[PDB]
Design an enzyme around this catalytic site. Structure first.
Site, mmCIF file in Angstrom:
data_model
loop_
_atom_site.group_PDB
_atom_site.id
_atom_site.type_symbol
_atom_site.label_atom_id
_atom_site.label_comp_id
_atom_site.label_asym_id
_atom_site.label_seq_id
_atom_site.Cartn_x
_atom_site.Cartn_y
_atom_site.Cartn_z
ATOM 1 N N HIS A 142 -9.123 7.637 -0.996
ATOM 2 C CA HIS A 142 -7.711 7.340 -1.168
ATOM 3 C C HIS A 142 -7.026 7.178 0.203
ATOM 4 O O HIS A 142 -6.338 6.183 0.444
ATOM 5 C CB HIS A 142 -7.033 8.447 -1.984
ATOM 6 C CG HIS A 142 -5.542 8.293 -2.118
ATOM 7 N ND1 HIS A 142 -4.931 7.966 -3.309
ATOM 8 C CD2 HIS A 142 -4.546 8.431 -1.206
ATOM 9 C CE1 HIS A 142 -3.620 7.886 -3.125
ATOM 10 N NE2 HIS A 142 -3.365 8.172 -1.858
ATOM 11 N N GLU A 143 -7.210 8.143 1.101
ATOM 12 C CA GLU A 143 -6.555 8.058 2.413
ATOM 13 C C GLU A 143 -7.063 6.854 3.226
ATOM 14 O O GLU A 143 -6.266 6.147 3.825
ATOM 15 C CB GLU A 143 -6.665 9.357 3.222
ATOM 16 C CG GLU A 143 -6.117 10.630 2.507
ATOM 17 C CD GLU A 143 -4.698 10.483 1.991
ATOM 18 O OE1 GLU A 143 -3.975 9.514 2.360
ATOM 19 O OE2 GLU A 143 -4.298 11.367 1.218
ATOM 20 N N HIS A 146 -5.645 3.492 2.324
ATOM 21 C CA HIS A 146 -4.329 3.194 2.919
ATOM 22 C C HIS A 146 -4.471 2.369 4.210
ATOM 23 O O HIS A 146 -3.660 1.505 4.484
ATOM 24 C CB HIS A 146 -3.554 4.467 3.210
ATOM 25 C CG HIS A 146 -2.838 5.026 2.019
ATOM 26 N ND1 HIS A 146 -2.018 4.268 1.214
ATOM 27 C CD2 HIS A 146 -2.813 6.282 1.508
ATOM 28 C CE1 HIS A 146 -1.511 5.032 0.260
ATOM 29 N NE2 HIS A 146 -1.972 6.257 0.423
ATOM 30 N N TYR A 157 5.835 1.081 2.038
ATOM 31 C CA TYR A 157 5.804 2.355 1.304
ATOM 32 C C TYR A 157 7.158 2.692 0.685
ATOM 33 O O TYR A 157 7.742 3.719 0.984
ATOM 34 C CB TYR A 157 5.370 3.509 2.218
ATOM 35 C CG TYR A 157 4.516 4.559 1.531
ATOM 36 C CD1 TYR A 157 3.327 4.197 0.919
ATOM 37 C CD2 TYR A 157 4.883 5.913 1.511
ATOM 38 C CE1 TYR A 157 2.527 5.123 0.311
ATOM 39 C CE2 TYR A 157 4.066 6.870 0.887
ATOM 40 C CZ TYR A 157 2.890 6.448 0.292
ATOM 41 O OH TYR A 157 2.030 7.296 -0.343
ATOM 42 N N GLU A 166 0.072 2.985 -3.454
ATOM 43 C CA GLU A 166 -0.506 4.240 -3.982
ATOM 44 C C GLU A 166 -1.588 4.044 -5.053
ATOM 45 O O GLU A 166 -2.609 4.697 -5.026
ATOM 46 C CB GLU A 166 0.596 5.132 -4.563
ATOM 47 C CG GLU A 166 1.200 6.023 -3.564
ATOM 48 C CD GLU A 166 0.153 6.888 -2.942
ATOM 49 O OE1 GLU A 166 -0.565 7.604 -3.694
ATOM 50 O OE2 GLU A 166 0.043 6.847 -1.719
ATOM 51 N N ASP A 226 10.661 10.705 -3.434
ATOM 52 C CA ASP A 226 9.302 10.211 -3.222
ATOM 53 C C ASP A 226 9.332 8.728 -2.869
ATOM 54 O O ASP A 226 8.543 7.934 -3.383
ATOM 55 C CB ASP A 226 8.495 10.471 -4.493
ATOM 56 C CG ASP A 226 7.030 10.093 -4.373
ATOM 57 O OD1 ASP A 226 6.422 10.220 -3.286
ATOM 58 O OD2 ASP A 226 6.473 9.683 -5.420
ATOM 59 N N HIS A 231 4.477 7.816 -5.706
ATOM 60 C CA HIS A 231 3.408 8.599 -6.340
ATOM 61 C C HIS A 231 3.619 8.809 -7.841
ATOM 62 O O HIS A 231 2.746 9.357 -8.499
ATOM 63 C CB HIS A 231 3.240 9.987 -5.691
ATOM 64 C CG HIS A 231 2.807 9.936 -4.260
ATOM 65 N ND1 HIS A 231 3.688 10.086 -3.209
ATOM 66 C CD2 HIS A 231 1.587 9.752 -3.708
ATOM 67 C CE1 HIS A 231 3.025 10.000 -2.069
ATOM 68 N NE2 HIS A 231 1.749 9.810 -2.342
HETATM 69 ZN ZN LIG Z 1 -1.560 7.744 -0.889
#
Ligand SMILES: [Zn+2]
Ligand SMILES: [Ca+2]
Ligand SMILES: [Ca+2]
Ligand SMILES: [Ca+2]
Ligand SMILES: [Ca+2]
Length: 316
Positions: A142-143, A146, A157, A166, A226, A231
């Protein structure tokens, strides 16, 4: 550093044993020279100063509890690199073999992980909400995803484009989990979230509403939290992606699943070819239909299933 490539052994956050690629030069360093321009893992030493120190070890054995998050960050970054190379023919996150850097032991009791524009960073958790976050391969992938998104589509974002950003990271995090193939599921973060409670996770792709996330466009979060719900509203896209792959009936709309490998190919093409920094959900739908068309024909089942999946989640 310059030295001799070798292989060490250690134990990861969940107590599993694995081999890791190291480099020897007086000490053994967590530097894997076998992948691109290298994978490098750093000790942030409970500070917030980055990257910290390249991880050095005296004997090439990594069995100390302090070592565990480093072992997993280093190993799963390798697996993620291998996924993008073998499955999508992409060399590292920038497509030209950029070195992959991670720091672990970031801050004290830090219940998160992130890509900071230049590297990955992993907290140790507080021991009850999270254990060290690099213990989850879906979290690592996941990271790193990005970074892939930042070098390709560049989705901002914020708002819908951030929710897409996301969802892409959740989707490929999950595909990488299935690629490595140890108890893969359609949940996010289950290996490192709440060690005291079994069966839960941070987010679910198969049923986002299990944790209160929207699974339909009519239920999207329209407020400011957020970053406009990046998210939260990702649940809508995650559900669409789950349906494309696995199939099902959602709010009365039936979707024939086309499987994980095609899901990956369609979304990787959408990402690298058709999405732009300000793409919204409706634009993602178009990008994904066009991708499936490119790959399988306008009258394929693949194109059909992508359309029904977005219809089922209310994205027109
Ligand atoms: Zn993320
Ligand atoms: Ca050692
Ligand atoms: Ca799992
Ligand atoms: Ca998972
Ligand atoms: Ca748990």
């Amino acid at each position: 550093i310059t030295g001799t490539s070798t292989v060490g052994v250690g134990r990861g956050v969940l107590g599993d044993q694995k081999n890791i690629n190291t480099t020897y030069s007086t000490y053994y360093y967590l530097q894997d020279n076998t992948r691109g321009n290298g994978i490098f893992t750093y000790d942030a030493k409970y500070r917030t100063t980055l990257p910290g120190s390249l991880w050095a070890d005296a004997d090439n054995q990594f069995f100390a509890s302090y070592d565990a998050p480093a072992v997993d960050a280093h190993y799963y970054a390798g697996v993620t690199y291998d996924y993008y190379k073998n499955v999508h023919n992409r060399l590292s996150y920038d497509g030209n073999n950029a070195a992959i850097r991670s720091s672990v032991h970031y801050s004290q009791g830090y219940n998160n992980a992130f890509w900071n524009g230049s590297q990955m960073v992993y907290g140790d958790g507080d021991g009850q909400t999270f254990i060290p976050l690099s213990g989850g391969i879906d979290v690592v992938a996941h990271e790193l995803t990005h970074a892939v998104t930042d070098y390709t589509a560049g989705l901002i974002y914020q708002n819908e484009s951030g929710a897409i950003n996301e969802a892409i990271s959740d989707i490929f995090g999950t595909l990488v989990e299935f690629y490595a193939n140890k108890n893969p599921d359609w949940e996010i973060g289950e290996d490192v979230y709440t060690p005291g409670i079994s069966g839960d996770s941070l987010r679910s792709m198969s049923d986002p509403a299990k944790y209160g996330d929207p699974d339909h466009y009519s239920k999207r979060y329209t407020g400011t939290q957020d970053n406009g719900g990046v998210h939260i509203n990702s649940g809508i896209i995650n559900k669409a992606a789950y349906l494309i792959s696995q199939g099902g009936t959602h709010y009365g709309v039936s979707v024939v699943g086309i499987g994980r490998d095609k899901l990956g190919k369609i979304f990787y093409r959408a990402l690298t070819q058709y999405l732009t920094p300000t793409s919204n959900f409706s634009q993602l739908r178009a990008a994904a239909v066009q991708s499936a068309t490119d790959l399988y024909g306008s009258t394929s089942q693949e194109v059909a299933s992508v359309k029904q999946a977005f219809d089922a989640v209310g994205v027109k």
